[PDB]
């Protein structure tokens, strides 16, 4: 209960304490996020926008 109350205290916030961050693993903390791997330069953004892999087939 005290943990849940402290979570509601620290809610919606950055730098919540160490024993309430996730535990997952050392490597899968010290590594890249979804957004940070999706971060990509605008050059290649234009590239992937203008010339994307099209959905094709072969009969005719």
């Amino acid at each position: 209960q005290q943990r849940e109350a402290v979570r509601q205290l620290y809610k919606g916030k950055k730098y919540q304490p160490k024993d309430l961050r996730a535990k997952k693993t050392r490597a899968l903390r010290r590594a890249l996020t979804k957004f940070e791997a999706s971060q990509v330069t605008e050059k290649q953004r234009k590239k992937q926008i203008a010339f994307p892999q099209r959905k094709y087939a072969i009969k005719a």
């Binding site: 099209r54 959905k55 094709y56 087939a57 072969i58 009969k59 005719a60």
Partner: protein, 94 residues
């Protein structure tokens, strides 16, 4: 890679033309029609070794006997530098 042969230029172009004819390309927006895919394209555009001659042709002769040509080609190539030396040393006289 750089093209310096026209038959190959033409053949690859022909393959591309066949491919563009032989496919249908969806939009980016979709509506995703039924496509009923093929597993491979190497089968349908097989690499094709070309013809060099039809089986039948008439004979013609030239009287060269087709061995002396090779022989004196060999001789000219191996004595080219010396024949050039003869030509140049008579050329630079006086």
């Amino acid at each position: 890679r750089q093209n310096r042969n026209q038959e190959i230029f033409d053949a690859n172009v022909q393959r591309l033309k066949e491919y563009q004819s032989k496919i249908i390309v969806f939009p980016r927006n979709g509506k995703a029609p039924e496509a009923e895919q093929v597993l491979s394209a190497a089968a349908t555009f097989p690499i094709a070794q070309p013809a060099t001659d039809v089986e039948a042709r008439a004979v013609q002769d030239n009287g060269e006997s087709a061995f002396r040509t090779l022989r004196l080609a060999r001789s000219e190539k191996k004595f080219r530098g010396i024949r050039e030396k003869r030509a140049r040393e008579k050329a630079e006289a006086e």
